[PDB]
Design a protein around this ligand. Structure first.
Ligand SMILES: [Cl-]
Ligand SMILES: [Cl-]
Length: 162
């Protein structure tokens, strides 16, 4: 199991523009296109991301390319973030993947806002961090996914994905 397989499971793969859990235009493997309510805006952003006139449809290869880019951007964002880098550096490999997952889903800023949880992860207080992370909109809106990520931080293994 690895970060790629992990996010492929949580985000799925769709080759046509679709709406995410929040109602935003998305494509591929969780690649957010725009927060704008307009499909055209979405099509415009897609074309600009792929580099061709896409008609709102892409290929598997294209979806994987966006995916590679997005994972890469997520890692780089953590490393450049003052609040995140220290947490990430303190973690083992499995838990690092779980932090990447969260950033991918909610953005660097979003994750950085979980001050208290961040402190608990850094101190290695697994069970306590897990309880605190559950007290969030994130968990109430996407409970199955949040539970998987949270278990990953609690145990340090991939059991939730197996
Ligand atoms: Cl892009
Ligand atoms: Cl869910």
């Amino acid at each position: 199991m690895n970060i790629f397989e992990m996010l492929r499971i949580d985000e799925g793969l769709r080759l046509k523009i679709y709406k995410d859990t929040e109602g935003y235009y998305t494509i591929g493997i969780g690649h957010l296109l725009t927060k704008s309510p307009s499909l055209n805006a979405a099509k415009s952003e897609l074309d600009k991301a792929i580099g061709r006139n896409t008609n709102g449809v892409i290929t598997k290869d294209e979806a994987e390319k966006l995916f590679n880019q997005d994972v890469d951007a997520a890692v780089r964002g953590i490393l450049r973030n003052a609040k995140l880098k220290p947490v990430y550096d303190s973690l083992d490999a499995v838990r690092r993947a779980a932090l990447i997952n969260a950033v991918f889903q909610m953005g660097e800023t979003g994750v950085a806002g979980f001050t208290n949880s961040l402190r608990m992860l850094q101190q290695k207080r697994w069970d306590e961090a897990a309880v605190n992370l559950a007290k969030s909109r994130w968990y109430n809106q996407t409970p199955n996914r949040a539970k998987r990520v949270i278990t990953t931080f609690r145990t340090g293994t991939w059991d939730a994905y197996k």
